[PDB]
């Protein structure tokens, strides 16, 4: 989409694992000045 | 059925990457029925 | 290496999480697909 | 310190995917630094 993409994840543990990865990538995005 | 959750993802490359991982895990789920 | 590439992972939980993803990718390739 | 493990990965694009995910998680690593 123009502001984000969506993905449907089956299962709470699985979702929490993918959210940890996604938040970490967003932390990586912040490293550039 | 199972509980599903929405992962909101920034960037097309990042989306394609997560979709690849999620599809592989779903094919693993499919083994058992 | 010529048969695989290796990555050092810090922490048991982190390793287990990546191993599950990696094995799922391999199972998808082996079942072709 | 921590305990370290080795992830064995097939394919160089798959290796670079895991490398990137791991590097992002490593921005979280610290003793309250």
Numbering used by the authors:
A (entry chain B), B (entry chain D), C (entry chain C), D (entry chain A): 324 to 356
Verbatim from the authors:
The formation of the p53 tetrameric structure requires a short TD region, which is located between residues 324 and 356 in the sequence of human p53 (HU-p53TD). The structure of HU-p53TD has been determined by both NMR spectroscopy and X-ray crystallography, and it consists of four monomers that each contain a single β-strand (residues 326–333) followed by a single α-helix (335–356), which are separated by a tight turn of Gly334. After screening a variety of different conditions, crystals were obtained for the HU-p53TD that diffracted to a resolution of 1.1 Å, for the TS-p53TD that diffracted to a resolution of 1.17 Å, and for the OP-p53TD that diffracted to a resolution of 1.35 Å. In the case of the OP-p53TD, the calculated Tm was 78.0 °C and the ΔGu37°C was 36.6 kcal/mol, which is very similar to the TS-p53TD, which has a Tm of 77.1 °C and a ΔGu37°C of 36.4 kcal/mol, but significantly higher than the HU-p53TD’s calculated Tm of 67.8 °C and ΔGu37°C of 32.4 kcal/mol. In the central region of the α-helix, the hydrophobic core is formed by the side chains of the residues F328, L330, I332, F338, M340, F341, L344, A347, and L348. In contrast, in the HU-p53TD, the side chain of Q354 from one monomer forms a hydrogen bond with the second Q354 of the adjacent monomer in the dimers in the HU-p53TD; however, the two L350 residues from the adjacent monomers remain more distant from each other than the corresponding residues in the TS-p53TD (4.5 versus 8.2 Å). Within these residues that make up the hydrophobic core, M340, F341, and L344 in the HU-p53TD appear to be more commonly substituted for other amino acids in the sequences of other mammalian p53TDs.
The four domains include a central core DNA-binding domain, an N-terminal transcriptional activation domain, a tetramerization domain (TD) located just C-terminal to the DNA-binding domain, and a C-terminal regulatory domain that is controlled through numerous post-translational modifications. To generate the tetrameric form of p53, two monomers form an initial dimeric structure through interactions between their β-strands that results in a two-stranded β-sheet as well as hydrophobic packing between the helices from each monomer. Next, two dimers come together to form the tetramer, which is stabilized by a helical bundle that forms through a series of hydrophobic and electrostatic contacts between the side chains of the amino acids located in the four α-helices from each monomer.
